[PDB]
C-alpha cells in the first residue's frame, strides 16, 4: 500500500517500468 | 508505459529493475 519510500513502495506493492522511469534521474 | 504487472522490488529487486528502465550503461554508480 502507501509508504513513504520507493524501495519499500516497490517492495510492499510493487513497481513497473513506468513507476521506475518516474523516478530515474539526470 | 503499457499493461505491465508491477514486480516486487524488494531489496536487489529495486536496483536492478531501476538499472533496467533507467538505463544500464549509465548506472555506473546509481545501482
Redesign the interface.
Known amino acids: 500500500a502507501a509508504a513513504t519510500n520507493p524501495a519499500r513502495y516497490c517492495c510492499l506493492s510493487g513497481c513497473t517500468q513506468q513507476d521506475l522511469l518516474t523516478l530515474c534521474p539526470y | ?2 499493461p ?8 536487489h ?2 536496483v536492478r ?2 538499472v ?4 544500464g550503461p549509465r548506472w555506473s554508480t ?1 545501482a
Not at chain 2, 4 to 11: A, I, N, S, V, Y
Not at chain 2, 20 to 23: E, F, K, L, S, T
Open positions: 508505459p503499457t505491465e504487472m508491477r514486480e516486487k522490488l524488494c531489496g529487486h529495486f529493475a531501476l533496467r528502465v533507467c538505463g546509481e
